[PDB]
Design a protein around this ligand. Structure first.
Ligand code: PLP
Ligand code: PLP
Ligand code: 3XH
Ligand code: 3XH
Lengths: 446, 446
C-alpha cells in the first residue's frame, strides 16, 4: 500500500509539477470522493474569528479550521433535528415520551445503531449517556475492585487532567496510597511519546499487581495513537481489565472494541463526533461482562423498559452497559449527535480514515520538505497517529501560534513554542493543508 | 389569610352567582396578575393529542394540560435561545467556549444566578449539571459515610423508584444489609400519606443510628409536601445529614434551602422548571460544608477555572458543590433551561405560589362540592401540598382516566381508578380547572 509521501510525489509527476505545487492539493481535492461532505458543515469565515487581524487576511475566505479534534464544526442539520423535537414538545408535550422518530424515553437507543460501525460494537454494548468523565467514573466503580495483591491502575504519564483526577479520586475512594497505586508510564529521556515495547514490558513485569489499565486511545497532546488491541491482550494475559478513554479516537481512527475484546471504554461526542459543546457522551462494555460486571450506581433507567413504569420499586436490571444508565436521556443532546451520526453513516469510517491518512500524510510531507527548526512530535508511522499532528518550533523571535491565529488558522497551542493541528476528513481539504503550510513557511521565514 | 374556599364563595357573592358558576372562574382569571404568562408557552391543541376522540371535543380548543408536574410545557423562547448558541457555533466554533452571552466553559454558571430565588440558595451553593439521579449519587458518595454505630438511610416508603434504587445501590456499595439499613417510613393503616408527628418520632427514636435522611420535598404519587425545615432540624438534632430530592418541589413550592440549613439537595429541570425531556439537573450543598464535605468523584470541571486549562494535573478543587462538577456543561441544555428561568424571574415564586394555592384550592373546592365516590389523597392543609392533587374514584363501571384523556385532559393515572392532576400557575387558568371539573362530573354521572 502506497505511503502518502509516495502518492503526493507520483501525483506531482503525473501533473508535471513539483510535489509542493498548489496544483497537487487541488488535484487531491478533485479526486476526494468525500469532498461533498464539506458542504454539510458550517465553516467559520476568517473575518469573524476573534483573534484575526483583518489587514493580514482576505475577507469572505473560509477559516482554516484545524481544531476539529477539540470542538468539531456544526452539522448544518442540527437545527432541523432540534426543531423536530421542539415541534413535538409544542404539539403533544408529555406524549412525546412514547411517540415519534425519537420517543424521548428511548431517545438514546433510537440512535445508538449509528454508533455500531464507529466503535465496532453491538447495540447492547453501547450506551449514549451523561458526559465523558462521568461515564469513566461509572465504569471504574464497577471494574476497579482492588485487593491486597492486585490494586494498581496503569495509565500514561501526563494523561488528560480529567482522567488523571478521576483515577486519583477512584484510588482515594479505596484509601489507596496514590504514589504506590497510580502507575504512570513515562517516556524515555529525550522523547515525548511512548514505545509500545516499553508499555508491554511494564505490563509483563507489573501486570499481576494491576487491577485496571486505563489508557487513552489517542493521546490528546502528543497525538500518539496507541495499539489498542496489543495493550488489551497484554493486560488481559496478566489478569488486568483494560479500558480506554477514546475521546480523541472515536470518529478519528477505526475501532473494533468488541472484536479486540476491550473490556470497557468511554468517549465524548463534541470532538471528532461534532455534536456540540458538552454533548451527550458514550460508554462501551464488552458483552462478555453482561452478567458478571454489575453497575455500582443504579437509577430507574437501568431498569428494563417493559416494567420500568410500573414503579413497583422491584429492580429488573438490564444486562450490560444499559444497566449503568441512571437517568432519562436528554433529547436535545440526542438531536445534535444524531445530525452528526447520519453524516458519519454516509461517509463511513473506512473512507474517512483513508482520507485522513493521505491528508495528514500530505501535511507531514509539506512540513518535512520545507523544514527538514520544525519538529513533529507525533509518531511518523501512519498507523500510530490519527488526524492530529503536534509540532514544536525553535524560533526565539516568533510566537508561531499567535501569528497563525491572526491569519485565520484555528488550532491549539502548547508551550514553549508549539501547536496541535488536526485536519479532519469530513470538512477539511487538501487545499486547507496547502494554505496552512504556506502561511507557516511565511511566518518562520519572518 | 383567607382560605381558597372562602375566596371563591366571597367572589361568587360579589358576582351574584353560585360558587360553582363559570363566571367565578372567568373572574379569577381576569384578576390573575400572572395571566399573561400563559402566552409564553406552547400549549397543545386538543385535536393533536394521540388519545383524543375527535367526536367528543371542540377542534382548535387548547388541551387541558395538567401534567406540568411531569413534563412541563415549552417556553416559546427555547428555540430562540438555542439559535443563539447554534449561530455562535456556526460563526466562531471553538472560540464560543470563551465568548458570548453564554461562554460554553461557564455555560452553567452564566445562568445559575436565576436559580437563587427558586431554591433559596447562593450562587456558590448551586450547581447545574448532569441528571437528577446522577446528582443524587454524586452527593450521597460524599454525605453517606456509614459506621458501625450510624449506618442507616431514612426515606419514605414507596419513594420514587429511581431514588429507591439509588439508595439501595449506595447501601450495597458499603456491603450493608438492605433490610436492616434501608429505613422506610410507612403510613398508618388506612392512610396513604405520612403524619409529621410520626416522621419526627422515627427520627427521635432511631436518629442516632441514621447517617442520612433522604426525603422527597414533594411526594410524586400522594402530592404530599413534607415540612422540609422541620425534618431538617429533627435529623440534625440527632446528628444526621438531611438531604432532599426536590424533583416535585422546585418551581412548585417556595424553598429556602440555605436559611433552613438543609445539608444537600438535588432536582430535575423538566417538570415544573419546563426545560424539556432529560434536561440539565440541579444540586445544592449548603456552604457550611464547603471545606469539610469533599467530592468523592472528581473531574477537570471541579478544578478552579483560573488554572484548569494549564492542564498540569495539579488539582485545585473548587470548594462546595462546584467541586462535585465533573465534566464540561451541555450548552444546548443550558439554553432550554435559561429560557424557562427568565420566565420564572419575571413571575417570581412568591406570586406563582400564591396563584397555585388559589388555583389548586379552587379545584379542590369544586371537587368537594360536586362529590363530597371521589377521594382526594393529597393533604388538605394548604401548606402541605403544591400544585398536584391525587384523586381516587369508586366507580366499577368507569375508567375515569381513559374518559378524561379522550376529551383532551392530560394527566397521569394510578391504579385501580385514580388520577394525578397538577394545574400550574405559569400556564394553567382557573377556567381550565372549571372545564376539567365539569368534564369529570359528566363522566362520573355516566
Ligand atoms: C421525576 C423524578 C425522578 C426522575 O429521575 P431522573 O434522574 O431525572 O431520570 C427521580 N426522582 C424523583 C423524586 C422524581 O420525581
Ligand atoms: C476532551 C477530553 C476529556 C473531556 O472531559 P469531559 O468529561 O468531556 O469534560 C476527558 N478526557 C480526555 C482524554 C479528553 O480528550
Ligand atoms: O481538546 C482537547 O484535547 C481537550 N479539551 C477539550 O475538550 C475542551 C476545550 C475547551 C473547552 C472544553 O469544555 C473542553
Ligand atoms: O412524573 C413523575 O412524577 C415522574 N416521571 C417522570 O419524570 C418521567 C415520566 C415519563 C418519562 C420520563 O423520562 C420521566
Amino acid at each position: 500500500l502506497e505511503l502518502p509521501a509516495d502518492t503526493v510525489q507520483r501525483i506531482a509527476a503525473e501533473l508535471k509539477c513539483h510535489p509542493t505545487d498548489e496544483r497537487v492539493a487541488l488535484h487531491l481535492d478533485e479526486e476526494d470522493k468525500l469532498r461533498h461532505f464539506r458542504e454539510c458543515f458550517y465553516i467559520p469565515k476568517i473575518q469573524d474569528l476573534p483573534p484575526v487581524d483583518l489587514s493580514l487576511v482576505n475577507k469572505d475566505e473560509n477559516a482554516i479550521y484545524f481544531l476539529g479534534n477539540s470542538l468539531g464544526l456544526q452539522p448544518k442539520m442540527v437545527k432541523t433535528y432540534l426543531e423536530e423535537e421542539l415541534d413535538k414538545w409544542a404539539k403533544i408535550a408529555a406524549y412525546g415520551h412514547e411517540v415519534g422518530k425519537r420517543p424521548w424515553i428511548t431517545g438514546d437507543e433510537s440512535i445508538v445503531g449509528l454508533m455500531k460501525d464507529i466503535v465496532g460494537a453491538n447495540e447492547k454494548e453501547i450506551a449514549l449517556m451523561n458526559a465523558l468523565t462521568v461515564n469513566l467514573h461509572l465504569l471504574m466503580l464497577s471494574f476497579f475492585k482492588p485487593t491486597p495483591k492486585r490494586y494498581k491502575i496503569l495509565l500514561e504519564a501526563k494523561a488528560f487532567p480529567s482522567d488523571h483526577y478521576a483515577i486519583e479520586s477512584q484510588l482515594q475512594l479505596h484509601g489507596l496510597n496514590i504514589e504506590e497505586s497510580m502507575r504512570m508510564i513515562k517516556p524515555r529521556e529525550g522523547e515525548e511519546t511512548l514505545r509500545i515495547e516499553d508499555i508491554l514490558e511494564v505490563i509483563e513485569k507489573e501486570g499481576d499487581s494491576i487491577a485496571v489499565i486505563l489508557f487513552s486511545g489517542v493521546h490528546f497532546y502528543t497525538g500518539q495513537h496507541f495499539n489498542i488491541p496489543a495493550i488489551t491482550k497484554a493486560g488481559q494475559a496478566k489478569g488486568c481489565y483494560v479500558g480506554f478513554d477514546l475521546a480523541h479516537a472515536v470518529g478519528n481512527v477505526e475501532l473494533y472494541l468488541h472484536d479486540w475484546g476491550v473490556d470497557f471504554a468511554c468517549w465524548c461526542s463534541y470532538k471528532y463526533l461534532n455534536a456540540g459543546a458538552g454533548g451527550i457522551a458514550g460508554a462501551f462494555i464488552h458483552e462478555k461482562h453482561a452478567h458478571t460486571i454489575k453497575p455500582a450506581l443504579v437509577g430507574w433507567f437501568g431498569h428494563e423498559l417493559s416494567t420500568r413504569f410500573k414503579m413497583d420499586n422491584k429492580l429488573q436490571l438490564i444486562p450490560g452497559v444499559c444497566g449503568f444508565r441512571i437517568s432519562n436521556p436528554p433529547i436535545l443532546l440526542v438531536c445534535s449527535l444524531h445530525a452528526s451520526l447520519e453524516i458519519f453513516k454516509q461517509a463511513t469510517m473506512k473512507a474517512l480514515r483513508k482520507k485522513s491518512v493521505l491528508l495528514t500524510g500530505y501535511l507531514e510531507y509539506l512540513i518535512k520538505h520545507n523544514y527538514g527548526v520544525v519538529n513533529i512530535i507525533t509518531p511518523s508511522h501512519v498507523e500510530e497517529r490519527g488526524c492530529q499532528l503536534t509540532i514544536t518550533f525553535s524560533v526565539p523571535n516568533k510566537d508561531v501560534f499567535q501569528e497563525l491565529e491572526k491569519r485565520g488558522v484555528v488550532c491549539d497551542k502548547r508551550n514553549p513554542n508549539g501547536i496541535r493541528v488536526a485536519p479532519v476528513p469530513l470538512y477539511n481539504s487538501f487545499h486547507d493543508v496547502y494554505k496552512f503550510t504556506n502561511l507557516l513557511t511565511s511566518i518562520l521565514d519572518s
